[PDB]
Design a protein around this ligand. Sequence first.
Ligand SMILES: [Cl-]
Ligand SMILES: [Cl-]
Ligand SMILES: [Cl-]
Ligand SMILES: [Cl-]
Ligand SMILES: [Fe+2]
Ligand SMILES: [Fe+2]
Ligand SMILES: [Fe+2]
Ligand SMILES: [Fe+2]
Ligand SMILES: [Fe+2]
Ligand SMILES: [Fe+2]
Ligand SMILES: [Fe+2]
Ligand SMILES: [Fe+2]
Ligand SMILES: [Fe+2]
Ligand SMILES: [Fe+2]
Ligand SMILES: [Fe+2]
Ligand SMILES: [Fe+2]
Ligand SMILES: [Mg+2]
Ligand SMILES: [Mg+2]
Ligand SMILES: [Mg+2]
Ligand SMILES: [Mg+2]
Ligand SMILES: [Mg+2]
Lengths: 160, 160, 160, 160, 160, 160, 160, 160, 160, 160, 160, 160
Amino acid sequence: SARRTESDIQGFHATPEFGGNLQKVLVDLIELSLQGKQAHWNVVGSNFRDLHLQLDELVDFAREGSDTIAERMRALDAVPDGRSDTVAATTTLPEFPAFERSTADVVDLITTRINATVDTIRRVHDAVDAEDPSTANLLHGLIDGLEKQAWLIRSENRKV
Amino acid sequence: SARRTESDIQGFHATPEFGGNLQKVLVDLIELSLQGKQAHWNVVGSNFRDLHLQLDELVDFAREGSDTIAERMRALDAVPDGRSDTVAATTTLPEFPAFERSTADVVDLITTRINATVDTIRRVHDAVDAEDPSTANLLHGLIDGLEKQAWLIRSENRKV
Amino acid sequence: SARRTESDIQGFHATPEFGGNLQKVLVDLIELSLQGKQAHWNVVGSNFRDLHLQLDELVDFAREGSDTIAERMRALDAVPDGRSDTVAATTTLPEFPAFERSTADVVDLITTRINATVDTIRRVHDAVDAEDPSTANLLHGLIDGLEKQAWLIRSENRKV
Amino acid sequence: SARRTESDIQGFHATPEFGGNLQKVLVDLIELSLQGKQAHWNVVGSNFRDLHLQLDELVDFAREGSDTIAERMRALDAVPDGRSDTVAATTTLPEFPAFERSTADVVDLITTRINATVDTIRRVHDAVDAEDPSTANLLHGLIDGLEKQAWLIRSENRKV
Amino acid sequence: SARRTESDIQGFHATPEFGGNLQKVLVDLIELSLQGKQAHWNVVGSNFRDLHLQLDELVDFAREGSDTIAERMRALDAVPDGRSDTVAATTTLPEFPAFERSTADVVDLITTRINATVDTIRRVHDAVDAEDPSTANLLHGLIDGLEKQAWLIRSENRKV
Amino acid sequence: SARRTESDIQGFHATPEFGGNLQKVLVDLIELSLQGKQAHWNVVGSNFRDLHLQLDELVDFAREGSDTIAERMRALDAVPDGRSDTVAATTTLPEFPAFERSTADVVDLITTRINATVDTIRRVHDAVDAEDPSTANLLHGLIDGLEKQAWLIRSENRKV
Amino acid sequence: SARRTESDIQGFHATPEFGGNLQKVLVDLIELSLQGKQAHWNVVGSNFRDLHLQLDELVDFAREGSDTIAERMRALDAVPDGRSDTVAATTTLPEFPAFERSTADVVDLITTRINATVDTIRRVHDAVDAEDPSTANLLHGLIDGLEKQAWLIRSENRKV
Amino acid sequence: SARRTESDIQGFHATPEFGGNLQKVLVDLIELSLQGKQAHWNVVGSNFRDLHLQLDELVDFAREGSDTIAERMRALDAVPDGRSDTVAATTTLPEFPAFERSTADVVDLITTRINATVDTIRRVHDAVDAEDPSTANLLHGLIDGLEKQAWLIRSENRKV
Amino acid sequence: SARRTESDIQGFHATPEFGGNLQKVLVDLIELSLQGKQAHWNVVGSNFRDLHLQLDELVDFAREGSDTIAERMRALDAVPDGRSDTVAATTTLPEFPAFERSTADVVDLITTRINATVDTIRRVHDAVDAEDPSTANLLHGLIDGLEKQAWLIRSENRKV
Amino acid sequence: SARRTESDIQGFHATPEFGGNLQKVLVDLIELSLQGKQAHWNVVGSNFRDLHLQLDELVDFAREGSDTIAERMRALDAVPDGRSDTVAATTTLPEFPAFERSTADVVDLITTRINATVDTIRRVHDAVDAEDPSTANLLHGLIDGLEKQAWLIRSENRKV
Amino acid sequence: SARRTESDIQGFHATPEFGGNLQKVLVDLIELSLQGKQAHWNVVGSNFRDLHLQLDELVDFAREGSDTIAERMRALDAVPDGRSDTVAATTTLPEFPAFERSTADVVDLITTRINATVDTIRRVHDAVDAEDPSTANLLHGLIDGLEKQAWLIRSENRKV
Amino acid sequence: SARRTESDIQGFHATPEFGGNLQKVLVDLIELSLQGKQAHWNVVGSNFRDLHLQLDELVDFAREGSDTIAERMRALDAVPDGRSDTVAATTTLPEFPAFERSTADVVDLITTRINATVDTIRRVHDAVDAEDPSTANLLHGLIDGLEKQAWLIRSENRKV
Ligand SMILES: [Cl-]
Ligand SMILES: [Cl-]
Ligand SMILES: [Cl-]
Ligand SMILES: [Cl-]
Ligand SMILES: [Fe+2]
Ligand SMILES: [Fe+2]
Ligand SMILES: [Fe+2]
Ligand SMILES: [Fe+2]
Ligand SMILES: [Fe+2]
Ligand SMILES: [Fe+2]
Ligand SMILES: [Fe+2]
Ligand SMILES: [Fe+2]
Ligand SMILES: [Fe+2]
Ligand SMILES: [Fe+2]
Ligand SMILES: [Fe+2]
Ligand SMILES: [Fe+2]
Ligand SMILES: [Mg+2]
Ligand SMILES: [Mg+2]
Ligand SMILES: [Mg+2]
Ligand SMILES: [Mg+2]
Ligand SMILES: [Mg+2]
């Protein structure tokens, strides 16, 4: 009665631009995960353990975030690229330095890299929201979670 | 002292239109749940097990979704109708066919029905968001979750 | 030695009548689940919370029951029909009323609907047991569980 | 290489008005949690246990909510004040009465105070959303959750 | 529409003899659980710990069994009596002795008392099954479980 | 250097008075458990479910309590007697009435029986504490736990 | 006082025929377990993973089933023989073929072997039920569980 | 034989002095909880994370403690007052300062406030123990738990 | 750059001799599992329960071991044979005797069968290690676990 | 209004006598833990498994006990010494013998050593209670727990 | 006294070659992780779901493996480099192709890449084992785990 | 039939030197666990909590390690000696100091003592491996785990 008589109903298709916007978020989340693990392993000095542990929590969040974004792309028939070459060639994050780094340095370095990642999400937000508010919801989750990590990490170096 | 002195403070009340819009979402979520179980029981053929299992995950999400929407109606002083006669008389989803269906047919059929359910949510979205953004947030969760199910189901039939 | 030399041994096949008998149970279990959720959402008044919660437990049991019955049908190569139109057209349960209902009314209404569902299982029991005692075992579980729910719900309205 | 150069990328900082708006939400959430426990301990009469238990769920939600808001403030460089004197001096919630209170009275009292808490969040919503949609997402969760609690609690006193 | 009309469909009610038969099972289950704890506390000697632990498992099973039977009585409009005076006055189990008892003695004593409990259930089985096969299903679980306990306990005293 | 050279070091053992006092606690705990289940099964009327559930929680605590006391006796070379005849013959608890009882009646009946049980523990407390403060600690747990149960149950019948 | 005064009460003893009948069930359950693992390890081809996993679930059920039957024999003073030589010499199941087998062949092969195992249980059912209905209940569980496995496995090969 | 024949047996009730003493403990526990969260949110500097985490554990314990004391009051017919105005007006704890505070400062501040809370419990201990040793047991748990928290926190600022 | 330009890279292939060596381990693990269950069911006498339980733990380990070995064979493209006929025809373990066996006898019997199984693993160890050290690692796990079981079981019969 | 204005509020600290008394408990708990493991590893003979398992449970409790006492010392500004040399030099426990020991011997040996440990706690109890009843509470837990362990172990060698 | 008297005892230090060898393993494990996710997101076609899920299990193992290797480097005073640029510049794995790939192609592609990763571990094995057998043990775990993944993935494409 | 004949197949027995080498590892593991707890309780100063927690993880690992070694000795017919006097008299670990120690000092002290424990295992490794590779596998786990702990602890004191 109210039933649609259509045998093939199409779902929501993302524009290629929308897919490209999520791709920008994806590579920065993957890069953040890789840099987070680098910091996690190579951090040394005063309050090593807290930072070591907090960095793993950041990596967990960024990895879950990259899944969320890539899966959202797929749901809307965009196609993600999380390969190493693409991530290195297109990430906006400043390169993480090599070798052992002090806890103080790692705090400042990782805070900057989190903030860079959040900036990318904030930059594409309005364009994403305009096409698909449901995806903007996912972006809000990432912004909230990453900005929480930034606070939890940077607070170590704060002097009051 | 910033304390209010009213003995009676009323809650947010949904308009009849708003109530009607959530009712539209509700009946399609219940119908999708019922069709999902039908497909889950009656699918046979190549890759039976994967689809059988994925369909149960779809049903779980749709059932949780119907609860969310119905409870949201109740919170806003609206009254849901999820009775079988009402669902059958008012759902926009094409009827699920009777008897055993092949994996390939079930994939196509259910994808269309998920697409139809999501279309209803997308159709009422802006009107809901205009009156109550907090409810639109719930709708974003439903859209994201269902379109993910559509991807996980439909990909069986996608060739190269 | 004692091994059967048969390359293709057939399993137990249910008669169509047996399948039809389980189908009667299936539609009443599905209808009970739908009515239970309707009551769960729309119940109001004294002792709201207990009934709200108990009704969800009833729905959980009826949903698990419908899976059990439909899966048993499939195991014996019967084909279930749990679609909304079929449920509405063939259920023996009295229609659940629309709108908010008092806890006292809901208690009486749902007790009657549980008892109707149990009656269907009791009605087909002997015919089912005669063909397949193993399925009668499943029916015993449903009778026991539903009659427990009837007691737990109806006790609210009992005056001694 | 699309890598950014800067070593000190600063995070999103909230305006004083934004921090002030989240502070308003925070004090009302803390007050609600304190009032919720007061009601939880001191409620007596018909259907005591259900209300006793539901009030604990409300408190749990309000406490998680206060953490969410205070932490969001910290993430955005704002400073929460959840101290007893501040909460008492600035909460908009009508004072909860001391001593034992009937279930019927507690239902009415707590519903009013939940509605007051929600009103604060609804009042600041648009200003919060205008500056930071990600924070508005957190507000939506709070509105949804608290309005659910209001329904679950107030339904006890409903007439027909 | 195959919907029934009646608003007050009554449930299956047990005959006085049926309730009496379940009452017989109930008192022997409660007595066994009390005797099981008595043995659990007071057993001493070679292989104490194994018997101590196994007796607790027996008690657990007997207690769950008593709940099952008493609740089944309630479901079928019968009224259990599990009070201490009634249990003592009507149990068919041989009295368990007071004071410390050897493991070997406890094995023999408890095996006899389990067997007595099973005998009661076996004695009422056919009359229960004739009136209500669903209840006989519950009896089968009790027979199976208790006879397993008897084997696990008595095997301690076996010769070759 | 400080090692004792004794081959057999004996444990602290209870005096006959002490053993007798714990036995008094034991029988009232078992009797409360038995009456608790009787009430649990046979309670009917307004707010049935809450009382039904709370009575099971009371029984769980009383059962754990009886184990605690009986095991403490065994630890101190005393012998418990939790057999039905002994419990019925020596309990100080007023007899629980037969048949179905209203929720209001069960509240008053059970509150009285909990209070009787606590009175027994309070009556023996000082004598127990004088001989063995470690056992008095166990009594404090029981008093606290049972008096909480009394509050949670009795509050149903309070009118303010 | 309704207490029995026998110092020795014997348990239910199975006849040799009954013991033999359960032994027939046991050897086919063990053989099915062994063949299930063989198939699980050696299946290759289209939809490998689903079958690999489902076969492990079948093995788990058959192993649990063999335990149930063997323990039931022990409870009734019968003596199981699950040794490899006996299983190989007395199983009624057709031999599982050697080496790697295709998914399609494994589906057909295992379905036949489940069918064979269930046939043994159905063949001995009435004789078992006549002597001991409680054991027949266990058989009903085995029939239901195994025929469910047969459906979940065989449906891979069922076309339209 | 030993059964009391009283229809109404009353529970142990707190004297006004006793109720007053527990109220004193209650407000300091709630105040500690509130200051604990304030410190948790606003702590910054060296070893932020450890302190952030430890303060949450302190708050969890203080919250459980406040429930314990308030529930104990209710059990003994006393009425708690945990409202914000009352806590602020009657707490003995030194006020927690506003704004961000260094880890070193928070360690000293919180240690002092924990000690103040414990002092209150130690001050009321003997009077509580004299009237009701069972409640003194609860006080012992609180003293032990809070003094552990003080050690775990203060140790950060120790120099040896 | 360092990337291999090969479109099809082959994995490690086990020699047929290596596969045959793992096959020897596999049949003895399967035989040990079958004999362990035989002992588990049929053991009687002093300390029945401990042995009954320990034998199940041995069986669990041997079953997990057989999976490990068979899966390792498959990973390296060997093909396991765990069929009943093959196990009986090729196992090196002495046959387990029929009928009920005393705990003392079972201890000695099972210790010998564990030791036989370990001997097979030790016999093939060097040949396995020489081709694939990673598989020798798995053998070390089995040797350690089985030799632990041998100690735990045999200790029952040790006289010092 | 009632707020203390002190900047530094000090915690309760143990006197040298108190610290010394807890140290005495600490070394006997650690020694018991060490002997418990020695017995656990080296026990052989009849009922090996039960004793092996029970000794591990004893060790778990003694280890938790040692943590409790040492942490209590730290909370009260006392310094524990649980080093091997100190434990060996100052423990009151009779030395555990070397080599394999029979189950009968281990039962007697360990019971004696548990009793020695409890004696130490009972000897210091009153002095501890006089200074700090909160710590006496911890001692009550240890006495109760260890005396339970003594009962569970010693009962093996009892003959009645 | 066998105690050493050095105030400083250094740990095992890896040679530069050893560090380099683990670095080779690390970059291929990270690359495999990244390629695994790419395949997981972008696979479409027959048996999509099984591969999608299995690829996630592969990624989990490879991520855990990279952690193990990097942490082992840190333990032995070596410094890992898991940054994207380094992984892309130094991995031996063939590049994963862009865009959607069929199930069959993904099976072949990923199998080759697992084979490549395992080859690196096998290539460095002997050099690692020669310097530090404990690290070789970790390598054995990686080889076993990855070759198992290769089997579970590749078997989809293996025909008869 | 490839079945062996012997009824008494003996297990692998360790040489006196082998048992002696495992005894060396055992005493150093027990000593480390005792020193670890000493440090855990008595550490104070900057980053107390992290070290406090990490030291407990070390103790957990060392205790599991000691069980592993002692049980392996038992499996191979060797007899462990983990008694306090033996540990003190034969441990190679430098004595841990008494009293409170700074975090910086504890980091250096514990790192040295972990390294000493690892050195013992590294010293006996080749002789253990030569006689029994399966035991060397256990040593590898210990080396890996302890060297990880050393890194996690020592990194606190690292400079740049
Ligand atoms: Cl509830
Ligand atoms: Cl799956
Ligand atoms: Cl931490
Ligand atoms: Cl056990
Ligand atoms: Fe994903
Ligand atoms: Fe719901
Ligand atoms: Fe189902
Ligand atoms: Fe928080
Ligand atoms: Fe019950
Ligand atoms: Fe007990
Ligand atoms: Fe079994
Ligand atoms: Fe509470
Ligand atoms: Fe396997
Ligand atoms: Fe500790
Ligand atoms: Fe890691
Ligand atoms: Fe151990
Ligand atoms: Mg599949
Ligand atoms: Mg209620
Ligand atoms: Mg006390
Ligand atoms: Mg720290
Ligand atoms: Mg035993």
